[PDB]
Amino acid sequence: GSHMQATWKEKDGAVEAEDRVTIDFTGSVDGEEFEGGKASDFVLAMGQGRMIPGFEDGIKGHKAGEEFTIDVTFPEEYHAENLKGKAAKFAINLKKVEERELPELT
């Protein structure tokens, strides 16, 4: 299945200004893990997808293959039809942290 819809050009080093890490986590919200209560290949954008104090903490993008637990709650603006206003808790495990650069930065 060779196609590749999305475009990526991330290197193989640590986290950078606006990168994208690969993390797997499992957590609950009000004491009960909802939909996203469990993620394996969670592609986080370091400084793109409103990296909140929670993700910006553990999922810094410095420990490729780490296992940590952080809190996460999405603001009133980050209301995505999938996880909008998700005030929950997660236990994540960092992995592939590279330097993604979709938009041309001049």
Report the CATH number at residue 72.
Answer: 3.10.50.40
d(CA 66, CA 73): 21
| Contact indicator for 19, 61 with CB cutoff of 8 Å | yes
Q: Which residue in 60, 61, 86 sits closest to 73, CA to CA?
A: 86
Can you give the residue range of the structural domain that contains 89?
1-106
Distance of CA 49 to the CA centre of its chain: 8
| C-alpha dist (Å) from residue 68 to 4, 55, 63, 74, 80 | 31, 11, 10, 19, 25
**CA dihedral for 31, 36, 42, 44, sign (positive or negative):** negative
On the 0-12 / 13-18 / 19+ scale of CB atoms within 10 A, 46 is: buried
Number of domains making up the chain: 1
Q: Which two tokens stand for residue 59?
A: 């999922």
Q: Helix/strand/coil (H, E, C) string of 18-69?
A: CEEEEEEEECCCCCCCCCCCEEEEEEEEECCCCCCCCHHHHCCCCCCCCCEE
